[PDB]
């Protein structure tokens, strides 16, 4: 299901082949200086060369920071990981502030890994030993091979296995006329019960009789995993299973992150390199979108430009909304953009301009197209006009209730009177502020 969101209209930056932003494309309109600025960092990400780079989307509220910020995830595509987070998610009750930053830093660095494994399936028809002519002294014959016949929907083929496979089979306690599972690369043999096709009657036992496996007896298909560094970190951190009583502590919540860096410089961060150089995994460095960064504490800001200096770190796309504002956690500090001067010195700021009536009108048209509203040309013009007064948010939010009033009034398109009636039932921030100031 679609479930239309507030940003389900932005499909991309809308840049041409020469890197110049179109006036209106891929849902975005205007902001050419910004959509071209934040387009270079897309190639920066697609290079997988730099680490710890940062770009700051600094502009007034409602200019489109989040609009063209998550649109980069569209241009980059879903293949590369994209970890969004608001500045209020750092404050936690079970994990220190400066640690949520690191945890999110490693969640943005993806690591796709590929493996190929042969597979065997089908009803085992017979397992007869292959004779070895008295390898030791005159005690008895020896199993040099074991002829196994596997039946499948395609065909039945006889195969030889090693004597160790024979021992594994004997200790596995399987019989003939059932379905087994063999993996020659590792050697482990798994069982899938008997063959539901002919082996079981109407009996009740849920032995999980697998139907006659359909397909070739031998099949190979590369498994492509998509694991992040944070996922493997938490895995090595919060083990699973039903043994090793330390792991049996499944009753406790165990939210206990703050992965010690020993486990970073040691495990997965190292086996990642040992798999990449081995030709098994391909690192997929992602993006770390941190909006409302002005909410981070002074400690968080200080740790930010220490983790951003590490060779293992993704790009960062900040979105600062406050102007010259006091840093949270300190006093009598008037750093611009609510970000310390030291950190602003490390980020590349992209200034988004203020939308003109025509650009806001285009945005309203696009949002109406996305929501599926059949807004008329008069209603659109009046919406643009009443949106030039207030912000773009209130202007473009008057499409769903107006459409409801239309449908209720026997209509199929928003008319000039519908948005006028809705404009009186609901008002924006400035109107409510004036009404409050007039009252007590």
């Amino acid at each position: 299901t679609q479930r239309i969101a507030s940003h389900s209209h932005v499909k991309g930056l809308g840049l041409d082949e020469s890197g110049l932003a179109k006036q209106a494309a891929s849902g975005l309109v205007g902001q050419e200086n910004a959509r071209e600025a934040c387009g270079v960092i897309v190639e920066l990400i697609k290079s997988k060369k730099m680490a710890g780079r940062a770009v700051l989307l600094a502009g007034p509220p409602g200019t489109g920071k989040t609009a063209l910020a998550l649109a980069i995830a569209q241009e980059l595509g879903s293949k590369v990981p994209f970890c969004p987070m608001v500045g209020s998610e750092v404050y936690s009750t079970e994990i220190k502030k400066t640690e949520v930053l690191m945890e999110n830093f490693r969640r943005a660095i993806g690591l796709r890994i590929k493996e190929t494994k042969e597979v065997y399936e089908g009803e085992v028809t017979e397992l007869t030993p292959c004779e070895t002519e008295n390898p030791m002294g005159g005690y008895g014959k020896t199993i040099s091979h074991v002829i196994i016949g596997l039946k499948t929907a395609k065909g039945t083929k006889q195969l030889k296995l090693d004597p160790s496979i024979f021992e594994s089979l004997q200790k596995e306690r399987v019989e003939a006329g059932d379905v087994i599972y063999i993996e020659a690369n590792s050697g482990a043999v798994k069982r899938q019960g008997r063959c539901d096709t002919y082996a079981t009657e109407f009996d009740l036992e849920a032995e999980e009789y697998v139907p006659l496996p359909k397909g070739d007896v031998h099949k190979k298909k590369e498994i492509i995993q998509d694991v992040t560094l944070h996922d493997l970190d938490v895995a090595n951190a919060r083990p699973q299973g039903g043994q090793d009583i330390l792991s049996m502590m499944g009753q406790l919540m165990k939210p206990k992150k703050t992965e010690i860096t020993d486990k970073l410089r040691g495990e997965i961060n190292k086996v990642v390199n040992k798999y990449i150089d081995q030709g098994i995994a391909e690192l997929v460095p992602g993006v770390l979108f941190v909006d409302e960064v002005h909410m981070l504490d002074i400690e968080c800001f200080t740790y930010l430009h220490r983790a951003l200096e590490s060779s293992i770190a993704p790009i960062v796309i900040f979105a600062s909304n406050r102007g010259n504002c006091v840093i949270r956690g300190t006093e009598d500090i008037t750093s611009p953009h609510g970000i310390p001067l030291d950190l602003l010195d490390r980020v590349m700021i992209i200034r988004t301009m203020l939308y003109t009536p025509q650009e806001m009108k285009q945005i309203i048209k696009i949002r109406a197209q996305t929501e599926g509203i059949n807004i008329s040309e008069e209603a659109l013009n009046h919406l643009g006009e009443i949106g030039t007064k207030t912000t773009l948010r209130y202007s473009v939010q008057l499409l769903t209730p107006a459409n409801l009033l239309a449908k209720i009034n026997g209509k199929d398109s928003i008319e000039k009177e519908h948005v006028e009636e809705i404009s009186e039932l609901f008002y924006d921030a400035k109107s409510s502020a004036k009404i409050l100031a007039d009252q007590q």
């Binding site: 020469s18 270079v40 060369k49 730099m50 090595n236 951190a237 703050t258 150089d277 200080t302 700021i349």
Partner: protein, 427 residues
Amino acid sequence: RIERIGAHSHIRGLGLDDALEPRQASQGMVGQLAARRAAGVVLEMIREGKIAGRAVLIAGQPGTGKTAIAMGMAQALGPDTPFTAIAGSEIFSLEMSKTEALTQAFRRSIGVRIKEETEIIEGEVVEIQIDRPSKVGKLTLKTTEMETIYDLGTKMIESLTKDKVQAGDVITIDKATGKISKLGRSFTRARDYDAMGSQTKFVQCPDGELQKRKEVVHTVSLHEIDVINSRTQGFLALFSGDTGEIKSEVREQINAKVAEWREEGKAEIIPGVLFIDEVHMLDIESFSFLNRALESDMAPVLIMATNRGITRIRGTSYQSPHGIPIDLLDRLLIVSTTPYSEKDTKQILRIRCEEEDVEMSEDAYTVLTRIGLETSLRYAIQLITAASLVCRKRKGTEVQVDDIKRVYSLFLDESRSTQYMKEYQDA
């Protein structure tokens, strides 16, 4: 292999001579002769490790190479010497106190290398016999020089069956424990050659005597010792989040036992460095503890990078230089870093662009140095890769002045954004 380059990956160590004389632009370090010489002196003091409990502070203008000098020292120190880099804001944890975090940070840079002389065997498996009924068997190992036959015991047979090694495998047999570590396979294959199987890979067989006395080494940090010794939770020192060490029952015992080991000669010492970046974040209590934490033979040297001037100390209202109280500041001697000049910034940009494998014209260097002298050095360094992308997008070869000038207008460094912040966005 794939670990993308960072902002400090270009320095491979202090560009010093054998007499601690810093070169102009050797080994990635450009200019900053005085601070580099001081860091070289303190590093020579580190590789000696006969005094512990000292500290050295590197102060200067923002973007002058404090963290750069720290990374250079870390690199020139090399492995086999614990180096811990921590920001002042990292000790503010919720699962442990500030003093506990500081103790852990200190003890994480004190290594104990126990030399163990364990005799083992190393040879290519030629044949194995095992009579299952207790079970008994034999083993034959081959090296390039000699061969022999072994009459395996019950437990050796059990271990080899758990490993389930086969002929041709090159393995190492620990005479003490019996652990079988297989390095790979010799030139042997085809268990049946009719069954399925993965691709085969082979490696040369071991050389020299079959049984030989080699030297293993186990190097762990004092923090890891106190950790695995803190409580009986199995396989600690990773455990994903938790350290609750006790002062006396564990810590003092670890110190005493390490001293005893040093006495007889099991593992004497290998001190490290604790680079505490942005130490101005530490609370007054953190400095109060650091005062007496340095007064211990197990207190490794620490390096602090400060950017603040005359500013109140966090956690109180006491104005003090470097945002550090004069109590802790009494021990550490301070090093001053001179702002980079025109030729220094130009050469820094040159090296940092040659690190990213980007070619910039002679005028590109001049314009970028102009920008990085009117603006901060970090912005001029960030403009090296941003300008290196438009060039490629236009199928260019080397960054020109036009690409840099365009990417300069595309972004704002620190002042072109605050000067334009004249719209009263929010406050």
